[PDB]
Enzyme design. Sequence first.
Site, PDB file in Angstrom:
ATOM      1  CG  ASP A 172      15.117  25.451  34.398  1.00 52.36           C
ATOM      2  OD1 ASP A 172      15.740  24.399  34.652  1.00 52.36           O
ATOM      3  OD2 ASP A 172      14.362  25.573  33.415  1.00 52.36           O
TER       4      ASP A 172
ATOM      5  N   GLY B 280      19.009  24.339  31.115  1.00 53.35           N
ATOM      6  CA  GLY B 280      18.908  23.268  30.137  1.00 53.35           C
ATOM      7  C   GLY B 280      17.864  23.523  29.069  1.00 53.35           C
ATOM      8  CE1 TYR B 281      11.593  24.913  26.787  1.00 57.53           C
ATOM      9  CE2 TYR B 281      12.336  27.183  26.647  1.00 57.53           C
ATOM     10  CZ  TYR B 281      11.456  26.186  26.278  1.00 57.53           C
ATOM     11  OH  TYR B 281      10.440  26.467  25.395  1.00 57.53           O
TER      12      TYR B 281
ATOM     13  CG  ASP C  19      17.623  19.499  31.791  1.00 57.81           C
ATOM     14  OD1 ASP C  19      17.932  20.659  32.139  1.00 57.81           O
ATOM     15  OD2 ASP C  19      16.488  19.200  31.366  1.00 57.81           O
TER      16      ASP C  19
ATOM     17  CD  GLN D 242      15.002  16.117  28.911  1.00 56.08           C
ATOM     18  OE1 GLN D 242      14.246  15.938  27.956  1.00 56.08           O
ATOM     19  NE2 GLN D 242      15.039  17.261  29.590  1.00 56.08           N
TER      20      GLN D 242
ATOM     21  N   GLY E 206      11.417  17.995  28.854  1.00 51.68           N
ATOM     22  CA  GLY E 206      11.278  17.693  27.444  1.00 51.68           C
ATOM     23  C   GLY E 206       9.866  17.708  26.900  1.00 51.68           C
TER      24      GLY E 206
ATOM     25  CG  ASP F  25       7.596  25.926  35.007  1.00 50.31           C
ATOM     26  OD1 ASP F  25       7.816  26.825  34.167  1.00 50.31           O
ATOM     27  OD2 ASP F  25       7.933  24.734  34.832  1.00 50.31           O
TER      28      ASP F  25
ATOM     29  CB  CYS G 267     -11.865  35.289  40.397  1.00 51.96           C
ATOM     30  SG  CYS G 267     -10.162  35.780  40.744  1.00 51.96           S
TER      31      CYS G 267
ATOM     32  CB  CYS H 260      -7.779  37.868  42.323  1.00 57.39           C
ATOM     33  SG  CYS H 260      -8.424  38.706  40.871  1.00 57.39           S
TER      34      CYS H 260
ATOM     35  CB  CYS I  95     -12.437  39.276  40.423  1.00 55.41           C
ATOM     36  SG  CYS I  95     -11.689  38.445  38.995  1.00 55.41           S
TER      37      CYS I  95
ATOM     38  CG  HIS J 221      -8.238  37.272  36.689  1.00 56.35           C
ATOM     39  ND1 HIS J 221      -9.249  36.930  37.561  1.00 56.35           N
ATOM     40  CD2 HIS J 221      -8.347  36.428  35.636  1.00 56.35           C
ATOM     41  CE1 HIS J 221      -9.947  35.931  37.050  1.00 56.35           C
ATOM     42  NE2 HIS J 221      -9.419  35.606  35.884  1.00 56.35           N
TER      43      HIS J 221
END
Lengths: 365, 364
Positions: free
Chosen positions: B80, B83-84, B134, B181, B208, B258, B296, B298, B301, B327
């Site tokens: 990133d 901007g966040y 941003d 935005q 945003g 994300d 699942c 994974c 599990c 998990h």
Amino acid sequence: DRPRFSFSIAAREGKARTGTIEMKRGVIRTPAFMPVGTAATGADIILGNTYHLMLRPGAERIAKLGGLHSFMGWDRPILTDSGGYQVMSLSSLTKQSEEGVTFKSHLDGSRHMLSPERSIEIQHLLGSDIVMAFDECTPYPATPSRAASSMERSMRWAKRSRDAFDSRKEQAENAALFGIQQGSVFENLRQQSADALAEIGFDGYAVGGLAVGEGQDEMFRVLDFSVPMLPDDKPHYLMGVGKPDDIVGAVERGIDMFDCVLPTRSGRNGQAFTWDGPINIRNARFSEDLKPLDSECHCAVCQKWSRAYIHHLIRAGEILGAMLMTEHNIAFYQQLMQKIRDSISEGRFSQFAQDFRARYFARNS
Amino acid sequence: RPRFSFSIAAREGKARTGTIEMKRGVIRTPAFMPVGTAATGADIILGNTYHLMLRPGAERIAKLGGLHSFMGWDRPILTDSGGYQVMSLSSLTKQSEEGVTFKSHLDGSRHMLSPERSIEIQHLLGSDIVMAFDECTPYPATPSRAASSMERSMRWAKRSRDAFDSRKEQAENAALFGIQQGSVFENLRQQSADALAEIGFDGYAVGGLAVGEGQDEMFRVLDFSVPMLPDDKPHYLMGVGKPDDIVGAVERGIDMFDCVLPTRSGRNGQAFTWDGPINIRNARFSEDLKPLDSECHCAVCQKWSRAYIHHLIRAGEILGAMLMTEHNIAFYQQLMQKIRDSISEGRFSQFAQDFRARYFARNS
Ligand SMILES: CNc1nc2c(CC[C@H]3O[C@@H](OC)[C@@H]4OC(C)(C)O[C@@H]43)c3nc(N)[nH]c(=O)c3cc2[nH]1
Ligand SMILES: CNc1nc2c(CC[C@H]3O[C@@H](OC)[C@@H]4OC(C)(C)O[C@@H]43)c3nc(N)[nH]c(=O)c3cc2[nH]1
Ligand SMILES: [Zn+2]
Ligand SMILES: [Zn+2]
């Protein structure tokens, strides 16, 4: 070269002591706080959760990787617990008998077992320098009947821990074994456990079965009569303690070693330890507090980061906030131990404990 | 392998499935991109640029070999822009047209973010997908506040494009994503999208959002915002989200995701299952011998039961949250795979109905 295990006291005051523990991998300055060791990405010794490590990634995997010293990137002494605490805290998943403790079978058929012999074997595979005897942290509260049977079983397990530890020359010549006193909050049972551990003989003696919800008043009361039951010429380890004021009061009662998850648990839950008591960094009072977490702290966080910066980091969901809180708390705990060791050497420890509690409880942060 | 090549293999409604080909590997879309960590099935992981420039520092990571060496990850990495954090830490910032200056620390150190400095830091981190600097407009925002913020971000997007192209090593091997935005306003969203397309980017992210607006409002903004982006380019919804948020977002043209919820839930006693999320701390799981999810695949599990994890967290063993976290991350990847499969089969519309029906009944 360095000795296997040598505990010497340099100064005393009341029941408090300061000194050193000499081992082949370094010196442990007492009273000592021993932080939780983690996998590699100022303390003298770190610990390893034996129960955790035997499940992930496994004691045998740790051994093939070079041990916990290689696993944690830590060449100084390491202490491992025995799993006796998880015998209690996970009792619902266990079948318990005189031979040992068997955990519930996993979904892949894997089943884990703990016993005096298997625990010492796992601690040897982990390559720890201080081995804890396999015990049972008696639940609190416990009836005098339940506490007696548990303590008596733990002393039978302590003897088997001694024998199993001595069954390996490589481990018996380079590591040390600590017995764990039990008896819940009862004086007579505490005396029986101490007598049993001393008849067997250990390099160190830990006070177990505390820090399980009893409260500081009850914990101090048990320490008042339990610690004098242990060999004076041997180190005293209070497992699970504790808060900064818990530690100061415990040193006043003969404790030389400490371990606690609060520095990390508080650092991840928005709580920092300072000389003016704990602070909740999430409070709006710190939104523009330009001061560091603690005015006297010498850690890396307090030299760079303000309370306001850390407050907004946690508010913004940045995990960096909790890392700085954790980093500060761990370093603060070591600074507390240093001030304790200094004050005992100076003969002013009683004054330090009074001044500490006065400023720590006024909460003038 | 090409620098950056996005191709669509199958469509259904506004949803798409396909691949993103880069020099370090292929990214199967729709994709969930987990948070990368320092070294101790996803196609790409992310790095918190603001975090990394403070710890241990962008220059230190560069000398260590980059984030690929830092995180032990040879596959693509996306970073990133910061901007966040311009918004989430605005109280500690001085903001102007040039960039964002953070409050000076107790050691004199001061950190600054700008379109040029952000791209430089992301180059130092060695990331494969670079986000334009941003400003994630705060929510809620007045139409006046949203307009000035979005317009400022578009001037920053152009400077991000120029700064990215100023390094041949970065422009020939990495990719740049523009961030749209406009808060929740249609006209402002169209102005941002038009501006980003005139500048040109390898990908287009919808910024945003996921800032407290609610799923109904988030879906409504996605309804008109995603069709404003170039169809032949990937669509990245930043911060989303819950499993049902992702399914609904794919229904509206999103190709990349994300979210911190898999880790935030795993540390707070919440696990995601096909029957909705479960609170493993409830006493109903004290003796539940089943895994977290029956389907699942994974590692957690296959070995650990709900009863075991319930008692681990109750006993304060940090191993409990690690299994929950492990998990949740793997469950998210299984959700994306099932979404990608159903789009290729042409049955995604049926999957979305079947998923929501079972996910909201909560028959765990
Ligand atoms: C906190 N109170 C508390 N801790 C105690 C322990 C240590 C057990 C902890 O050691 C940690 O690894 C280093 C593990 O992380 C958590 C999760 C804290 O639990 C493990 C004890 N250990 C043994 N063998 N015997 C006891 O009677 C005993 C009593 C305790 N009371
Ligand atoms: C959760 N909601 C949400 N995330 C968003 C982001 C990503 C910012 C997050 O990416 C994560 O690292 C990969 C970090 O995890 C936390 C700590 C949550 O913050 C970082 C955004 N990023 C940019 N550049 N611009 C935006 O408009 C924007 C909007 C968002 N809404
Ligand atoms: Zn500090
Ligand atoms: Zn799973």
